[PDB]
Design a protein around this ligand. Structure first.
Ligand code: ZN
Ligand code: ZN
Lengths: 114, 49, 138
């Protein structure tokens, strides 16, 4: 779910199992630096690929000129009855025609998808 | 979605079906509006061109 | 208090020339460098070319500590000028232009694979077995 790097030579960390204490042991095999990982996860792959695109969308896309501009469907944190709607248009990441609403206020940026 | 079809594919198929039905209906109305003396009708009922 | 409306007014001074040339470091924060380790330092020349237009070298604590190699920035300071403001008891800021900016990166201290024996594990282009124990043979 996440990776980190070595400390004193600053290299990439590889897994290792421990023969005695039976705990997974991430280690740099360019070194002898051994430590445990609290995540206890090494590999995950969402093959159907239902990632959350709410973190994917830049908060500054709303201030685009050539994007659409609706008047209904107001924002949540602020009222601001004006918003922009568009689609993801990302290849290989699903086929949904469902719309991605972003608030267009200069200091807002709470985006929602209904 | 239509079974066996992509959601974009079935959306495009529905839009194409609606616009083709519209063009068929408007062509039928235009053909019914033609007079007997209309030469455009005569050229295509004769089959010359 | 006084810090809620604190106003500080200091004097900027530029001397014309200094007998000792000044420059600037470049360390990444992701390197996680400490200054308590800085007990003995070396800064010498590279010998790979064999001097002013040649990349740099630095040593920490001899061979025990980590190693850096310095390279000069590619851009020219024809339209840029960088100043260093130093605090002094007289209270007047000093403005000193830097000469060059050098970039430094850490180096590993281990049995790196030499090039004359690097060709034997290229026949195992895809046939390579046990990536995790290549260092064990060395
Ligand atoms: Zn390491
Ligand atoms: Zn808002």
């Amino acid at each position: 779910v996440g990776i980190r790097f070595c400390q004193e030579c600053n290299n990439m960390l590889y897994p290792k199992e421990d023969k005695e204490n039976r705990i997974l042991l991430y280690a740099c095999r360019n070194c002898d630096y051994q430590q445990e990982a609290d995540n206890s996860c090494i590999y995950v792959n969402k093959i159907t690929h239902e990632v959350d695109e709410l973190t994917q969308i830049i908060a500054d896309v709303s201030q685009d000129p050539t994007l659409p501009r609706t008047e209904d469907h107001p924002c949540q944190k602020c009222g601001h009855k004006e918003a922009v709607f568009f689609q993801s248009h990302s290849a290989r990441a699903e086929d949904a025609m469902r719309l991605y609403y972003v608030c267009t206020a200069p200091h807002c940026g709470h985006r929602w998808t209904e | 979605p239509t079974p066996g079809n992509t959601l974009r594919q079935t959306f495009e198929n529905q839009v194409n079906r609606i616009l083709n039905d519209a063009r068929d209906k408007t062509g039928s109305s235009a053909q019914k509006s033609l007079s007997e003396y209309n030469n455009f009708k005569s050229m295509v009922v004769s089959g010359a061109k | 208090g006084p810090s809620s409306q604190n106003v500080t007014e200091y004097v900027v001074r530029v001397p014309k020339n200094t007998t000792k040339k000044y420059n600037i470091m470049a360390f990444n924060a992701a390197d996680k460098v400490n200054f308590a380790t800085w007990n003995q330092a070396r800064l010498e020349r590279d010998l790979s070319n064999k001097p002013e237009d040649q990349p740099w070298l630095l040593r920490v604590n001899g061979k025990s500590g980590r190693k850096f190699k310095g390279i000069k920035k590619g851009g020219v300071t024809e339209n840029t000028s960088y100043y260093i403001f130093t605090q002094c008891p007289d209270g007047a800021f000093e403005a000193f232009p830097v000469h060059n900016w050098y970039n430094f990166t850490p180096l590993a201290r281990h049995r790196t694979l030499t090039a004359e024996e690097a060709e034997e594990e290229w026949e195992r282009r895809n046939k390579v077995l046990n990536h995790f124990s290549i260092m064990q043979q060395r």
